[PDB]
Design an enzyme around this catalytic site. Structure first.
Site: not given
Ligand SMILES: Cn1nc(C(F)(F)F)cc1B(OC[C@H](O)CO)c1cc(C(F)(F)F)nn1C
Ligand SMILES: *[B-](O)(c1cc(C(F)(F)F)nn1C)c1cc(C(F)(F)F)nn1C
Ligand SMILES: Cn1nc(C(F)(F)F)cc1B(O)OC[C@H](O)CO
Ligand SMILES: Cn1nc(C(F)(F)F)cc1B(O)O
Ligand SMILES: Cn1nc(C(F)(F)F)cc1B(O)O
Ligand SMILES: Cn1nc(C(F)(F)F)cc1B(O)O
Lengths: 403, 729, 402
Positions: C358, C388
């Site tokens: 990520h 998110c």
């Protein structure tokens, strides 16, 4: 290209000075929350759930300005968690880029009501605090021939033939018009005084201003970017690209350059349906925006092609614009802009500029935009063009029309 | 992962192993293939074998001493390997220096002290070996030098020199003082700056002093023995890391300052050193070392490093070995030197001759003039005292060998004459006639001459066998080339005696056959004339000067033209017009001649007359003449800067080829070193002859690309850029 | 109006945090390498038509400060008129850049825009930029700052996701990422990183552990129990979610997103821009949307953002062929799958951040391009990409293959 974007509110804090400034004790997050609360004060029944984003420009998003200060302002002020919050950095035009991005988000039809502006507490977070992908990479710094904005301004004055008296004459002009605008009450409704958590006053005026400035005092100032070019060798680097120039005439001082100040600005931008649904009176309409650029190393000739591009985009000419607003980063940049497009003197920075009031990097774009919304309404004029030069060599321009 | 250069499927052994009863291992480097330890394939396998053994016997080893059995410590590498490394060999170049540094990293993290016993010169990889040790002791003996000079060859210290000196001194000091210019240090100054920790008087004390330090280090600091400062938890880089607030404020000014010093010249090595230094300071030591390898592979496989390596290791070494000196001649020691003329040339020749140890008689017309000639040496020695280089004793003996005189009888007992008066053949005839009989019968009759053929000057003396041209360059104390011109009647023995004199005074010789302009003056003439032509064509003077500096020249051409005097450039064009119209033909005037005459007509003939292309005030240069842009309508012609740069470089390169075609020069080694040291041809080219074979532009590389680019310049600027037949097929 | 199309969507491999291959590579170089790959694919592209370069970056400090988007424009030799702006909307910065680029094209005032992100987390760690909250106890105290990690554990507690449940999703992500790499799905979009000499630095996603077993995932320790006690964030979270007695800490380094370095670039332009430059459109940006939820749980923003972007395009779940939600934490994806009833075989079909990493500012543009490729590989029509965000935000985007 369908939904018209309108400016409903455009406010700003006063600009506190760098040395012994009144806003030095004020967190930049507090400067934005104060403007949010002023928007609530002017529109108490507004449904903040309709606000879909808060876009803040910030050139040094570090320290007190790190961690997405736009989202922090949303959460700190108690705005709905659905109101988003994004920080962006396009150097000096960050404040106007936030406004333009908000306008383009409205034009796309996928956002209805957006807060835009900027924040920069330069007394707490100085320029360069964020490091820089360029300055930490000598292999690239060496190749692109990095030269600070200040040497480019002296280089512009050298090439265009602007003397030390010429740039100091514009600096005096900016101080006079800024004082006339403050005395005339032009800024009474848009400069929102900063107050502490007890309601006590902190600052209600642009304290960087020197209204008693004289031609004699400006001529006594020492050129401020002369030891920068000698100790850093930036003069020799600039003349390596501009090899037809023999010597750079260093004319810029602290009195004819923009001031280091703290401040913030907010602009409420939305569609016509958003204004009618919440009972908001449109003050102006975003006619067109444009992003361009020009010669690097010089770094500050970017606002000329961006203005022609936004005029070409809106189908207008220089004669159709009633007010021209260009940020006063350095006096030579404004004089070059006035010389290139033959801008009438009576239309250029009519209420003063950053030389008198300061240049809070991330917020300046939204400050001078709101200044033109107020001045179009006060003069009952129609169109204004707002533009800023940018570091690296780019420019951003915006045309607004009073409604 | 391995300490070796090969892990499949045979080098020699260059390191002797010795373990004492105390467990101290002494590695003595003694390469049998030469008089100097060098980073060749044999060394890499020898050190890899020793480092493996150091790890295998770690339970019985308490410390390590790295020593050398040669007169020097360790200096250099196998150059034939690096100069042949192609861009497709970058992976092997990268793997080679990674293996080299993996050995030094293991030696450095052994858990026990390692001491460098530096007996002599430690240069490049030699100092890098020492920097991997935890303590460095040097023997303060004459001739010893310590430094990382690979930037002078277009390389960088790829064996840890960049990474370790930055860890030791920080980015700014390591770059400025050690890396950027490859400064060599005497043992005393090396200890002052921290490059070396201790000194001893003789080489015999080195190994015992090393083992004594190992014994005391283990007793006094057992926790940090064999642990470098950058391998401790609380290490703080001097001057800070790039993330530290103080250094992050000035760090953007480092590349601009470097660009100021190089004046925009295309030298990639200092740029790569600064990048590797800064990028390395942002990460751990091992990551920093790997970044250093990648930038090293960029330079080795590049063209500039191949140009610079060609000039130093093959051209300069061939010259210093006697490549242009004739074969059969032996030595003839020189007792007393006679300098005719006390100007900046004669006074400079008297200084470099006295500094080497010779007695010098300095004659002029009056004692007042000859005294001000010796005063040139007094004021050079006065600055040498204040800077602390030479002592008070040696300076008084230096000036004592200079005897200022006006009487021709004081040349009694002179066996080496160096005339340096005005450029006039009939004057040189008389001055040698007044002097050839007072001097010894075996004396060399040398003449410092810029253009006048030596064969014509020799007809004014009896013994033309010993008449020769000895061309110096101003200022003589700083310029390192001596252009020796062989006249038609000059003997082979006179060449060797002047050749040996040039080496004795610490200068580099070239041997040139007699011709108008010789090599240096003729080639530098195409450089200044090419710029004056650009000025007459309408190119901005500031652009011309920038083109000269960004090309890599030590002085811009208009600035240099004011110092050579335009009246002298005029009568060289008048003399060459006689060299054709007397033979019965038509002269081809250089377009620069019209600019020279227009400046003379305006009374601006150079620095001597107080005004030229520049204005002069208080004996210093004061910018360009403001009227210069109106006189030549500057700005009307705006060619790209690279065209101006190429026009100057190609003019000299083509003129150098002509000198090799005609026989003015007899080797490309003389042409390259002569152009670099004599007239300031940019070092990155490796010489005005190497410029052709190693040319590199957007169109290609090599002789064929030089020919193609020369034809672009010819079609656009004139037939003088058309290449000679010798460069074609 | 003016439709916004995707013409190219590439990304670097993701290098791991510890002893990572990309640790020696400046994040500016990661972006320039992708710019140079776009040139190799369109060498006759008139770069003067490119009007902006919008990069997401969550920690714009040090190597990533000073508007790294503008630095990439100058370092790569792009025209000075090509702009360059950095933005930060936490984890959705990469997708926000793409969405902002699409909205700039729809507005008609930009014609061809480069968009994406860059994050060198091994060189510029998370939180390096300070933060207007952590330096302001008055507002930190009031907004009840709780790290995203504890909010993920809290989501698992409320929804009833066990440690075996989140570990089962982690294994699923490792398998599908390994199947995608070995199947050649990523061959054309992952651009290997090379040094100044052309030597290979990295050509694959190092963080992947394709030999992951459910027995090995169960041996891992909860990574954020040490964070919960030292900071007291568990107590702060339960003061708002007062009906919950105790937070079950189920998230480990094996079922949470990987800390990696990487970058991504997307070329977005109008139909006239692609026609004028000989570009074949790969997909169309149907609609974008932004919303959010509670900032103490923080990670429940995707559900209203996905709901909003579906209403705006006149579509529902059954109209979408592929769902791509960033695998910040396993419970966030399971919560998303449960709320909107996403079919299992449509959700993160090529693996996600648990396997591949990520890189904050770049992830939105990476998974956006991951769906552009999988739509053409399956010859499917629609895909929905969402992430998110820190602070309780959410961003969603719907693309349609052309
Ligand atoms: C003489 N010399 N010795 C070293 C040594 F490495 F041994 F320390 C370096 C130099 B050197 O530079 C001189 C130094 O910069 C001071 O002016 C040089 C000259 C040449 C030439 F070929 F063009 F002549 N090539 N180089 C590398
Ligand atoms: B190895 O044999 C070596 C060098 C190269 C390269 F192409 F990169 F130049 N490739 N290999 C296999 C080697 C090392 C050295 C030394 F000089 F010691 F560094 N010399 N060789 C031949
Ligand atoms: C060889 N050198 N290196 C540097 C430095 F690395 F410090 F920048 C400066 C010089 B130098 O001699 O000055 C003139 C120059 O050589 C002409 O281009
Ligand atoms: C043989 N040699 N190599 C070097 C260098 F630069 F590579 F280290 C220097 C010398 B020398 O001065 O003889
Ligand atoms: C002599 N030498 N050869 C190499 C090469 F090319 F093989 F990599 C490197 C060095 B050195 O570090 O001095
Ligand atoms: C003498 N000098 N050389 C350098 C450089 F860049 F070449 F290393 C910097 C300076 B200085 O300004 O002190």
């Amino acid at each position: 290209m369908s939904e018209e974007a309108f400016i409903y509110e455009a406010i700003r804090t006063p600009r506190g000075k760098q040395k012994n400034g009144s806003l030095h004790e004020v967190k930049p997050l507090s400067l934005v929350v104060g403007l949010i609360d002023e928007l609530r004060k002017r529109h108490p029944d507004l449904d903040e759930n309709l606000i879909s984003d808060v876009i803040l420009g910030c050139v040094s998003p570090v320290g007190d300005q790190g961690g997405d200060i736009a989202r922090a302002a949303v959460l700190a002020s108690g705005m709905p968690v659905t109101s988003g919050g994004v920080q962006l950095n396009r150097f000096c035009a960050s404040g106007l880029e936030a406004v333009n991005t908000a306008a383009q988000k409205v034009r796309s039809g996928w956002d209805d009501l957006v807060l835009a502006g900027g924040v920069e507490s330069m007394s707490r977070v100085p320029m360069g605090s964020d490091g820089g992908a360029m300055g930490l990479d000598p292999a690239t710094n060496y190749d692109v021939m990095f030269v600070p904005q200040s040497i480019g301004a002296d280089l512009i004055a050298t090439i265009e033939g602007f003397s030390r008296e010429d740039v100091d004459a514009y600096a005096l002009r900016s101080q006079q018009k800024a004082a006339e605008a403050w005395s005339g009450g032009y800024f009474a409704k848009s400069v929102v005084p900063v107050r502490d958590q007890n309601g006590l006053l902190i600052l209600d005026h642009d304290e960087h201003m020197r209204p008693d400035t004289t031609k004699e005092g400006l001529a006594k100032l020492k050129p401020a970017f002369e030891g920068l070019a000698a100790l850093g060798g930036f003069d020799d680097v600039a003349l390596q690209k501009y090899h037809w120039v023999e010597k750079i005439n260093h004319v810029h001082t602290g009195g004819n350059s923009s001031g280091i100040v703290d401040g913030a600005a907010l602009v409420m931008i939305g569609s016509a349906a958003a204004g009618k649904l919440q009972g908001l009176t449109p003050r102006a309409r975003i006619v067109a925006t444009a992003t361009s650029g020009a010669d690097p190393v010089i770094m500050l000739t970017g606002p000329t092609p961006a203005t022609r591009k936004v005029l070409d985009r809106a189908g207008l000419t220089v004669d159709d614009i009633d007010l021209f607003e260009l940020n006063e980063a350095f006096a030579s940049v404004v004089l070059k802009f006035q010389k290139d497009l033959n801008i009438p003197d009576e239309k250029l920075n009519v209420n003063g500029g950053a030389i008198a009031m300061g240049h809070p990097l991330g917020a300046t774009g939204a400050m001078i935009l709101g200044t033109m919304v107020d001045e179009l309404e006060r003069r009952n004029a129609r169109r204004a063009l707002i533009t800023l030069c940018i570091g690296g060599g780019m420019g951003v321009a915006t045309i607004i029309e009073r409604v | 992962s391995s300490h070796h250069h090969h892990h499949h499927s045979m080098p020699d052994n260059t390191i002797q192993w010795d373990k004492d009863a105390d467990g101290i291992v002494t590695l003595t480097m003694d390469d049998p293939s030469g008089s100097t330890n060098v980073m060749n394939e044999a060394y890499i396998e020898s050190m890899g074998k020793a480092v493996d053994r150091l790890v295998a016997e770690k339970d019985s080893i308490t410390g390590v001493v790295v020593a050398s059995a040669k007169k020097t410590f360790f200096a250099g590498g196998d150059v034939k390997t690096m100069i042949q490394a192609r861009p497709e060999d970058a992976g092997d170049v990268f793997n080679t220096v990674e293996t080299i540094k993996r050995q030094l990293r293991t030696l450095e993290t052994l858990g026990k002290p390692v001491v460098a016993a530096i007996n002599g010169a430690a240069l490049g990889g030699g100092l890098e070996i020492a920097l991997a040790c935890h303590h460095r002791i040097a023997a303060d003996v004459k001739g010893s030098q310590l430094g990382l000079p690979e930037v002078t060859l277009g390389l960088l210290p790829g064996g840890g020199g960049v990474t370790r000196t930055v860890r030791m001194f920080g980015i700014q000091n390591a770059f400025v003082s050690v890396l950027a210019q490859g400064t060599r240090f005497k043992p005393a100054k090396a200890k002052e700056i921290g490059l070396v920790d201790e000194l001893v008087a003789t080489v015999e004390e080195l190994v015992p002093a090393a083992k004594a330090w190992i014994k005391e280090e283990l007793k006094a600091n057992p926790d940090g023995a064999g642990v470098q400062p950058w391998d401790k938890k609380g290490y703080k880089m001097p001057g800070g890391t790039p993330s530290s607030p103080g250094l992050a404020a000035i760090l953007p000014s480092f590349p601009s300052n470097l660009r100021k010093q190089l004046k925009g010249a295309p030298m990639p090595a200092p740029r790569a050193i600064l990048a590797a230094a800064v990028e390395g300071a942002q990460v751990d030591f091992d990551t920093a070392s790997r970044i250093e390898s990648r930038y090293f592979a960029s330079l080795v496989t590049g063209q500039v490093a191949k140009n610079m390596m060609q000039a130093f290791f093959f051209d300069l070494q061939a010259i210093n070995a006697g490549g242009s000196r004739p074969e059969g001649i032996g030595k003839t020691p020189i007792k007393r030197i006679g300098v005719l003329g006390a100007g900046m040339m004669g006074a400079g020749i008297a200084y470099v001759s006295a500094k080497a140890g010779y007695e010098v008689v300095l004659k002029d017309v009056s004692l007042e003039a000859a005294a001000k000639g010796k005063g040139y040496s007094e004021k050079l020695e006065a600055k040498a005292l204040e800077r602390g280089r030479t002592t008070q004793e040696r300076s008084d003996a230096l000036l004592a060998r200079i005897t200022p005189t006006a009487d021709a009888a004081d040349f009694k007992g002179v066996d080496f004459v160096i005339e340096a008066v005005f450029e006039n053949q009939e004057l040189k005839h008389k001055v040698f006639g007044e002097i050839e009989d007072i001097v010894e019968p075996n004396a060399i009759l040398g003449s410092n001459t810029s253009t006048l053929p030596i064969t014509g000057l020799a007809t004014g003396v009896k013994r033309q066998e010993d008449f020769i041209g000895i061309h110096f360059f101003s200022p003589v104390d700083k310029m390192p080339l001596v252009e020796i011109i062989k006249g038609e009647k000059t003997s082979d023995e006179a060449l060797a005696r002047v050749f040996d004199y040039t080496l004795a005074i610490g200068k580099t010789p070239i041997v040139v056959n007699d011709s108008r302009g010789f090599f240096t003056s003729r080639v530098i003439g195409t450089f200044v004339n090419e710029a004056l032509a650009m000025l007459g064509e309408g190119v901005e003077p500031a652009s011309i000067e920038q083109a000269g500096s960004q090309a890599g020249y030590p002085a811009p051409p208009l600035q240099l033209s004011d110092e050579l005097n335009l009246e002298l450039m005029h009568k060289i064009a008048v003399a060459t017009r006689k060299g054709v119209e007397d033979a019965g033909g038509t002269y081809q005037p250089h377009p620069a001649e019209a600019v020279v005459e227009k400046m003379i007509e305006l009374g601006r003939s150079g620095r001597l007359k107080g005004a030229g292309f520049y204005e002069y005030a208080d004996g210093k240069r004061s910018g360009l003449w403001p009227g210069l842009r109106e006189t030549f309508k500057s700005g009307s012609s705006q060619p790209p800067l690279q065209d101006m740069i190429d026009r100057m470089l190609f003019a000299e390169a083509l003129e150098t080829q002509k000198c090799l075609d005609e026989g003015v020069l007899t080797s490309t080694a003389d042409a390259n070193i002569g152009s670099i040291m004599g007239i300031g041809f940019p070092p990155w080219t490796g010489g005005s002859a190497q410029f052709i074979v190693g040319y590199s532009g957007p169109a290609g590389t090599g002789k064929a690309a030089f020919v193609a680019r020369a034809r672009e310049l010819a079609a656009a600027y004139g037939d003088r850029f058309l290449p000679p037949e010798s460069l074609l097929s």
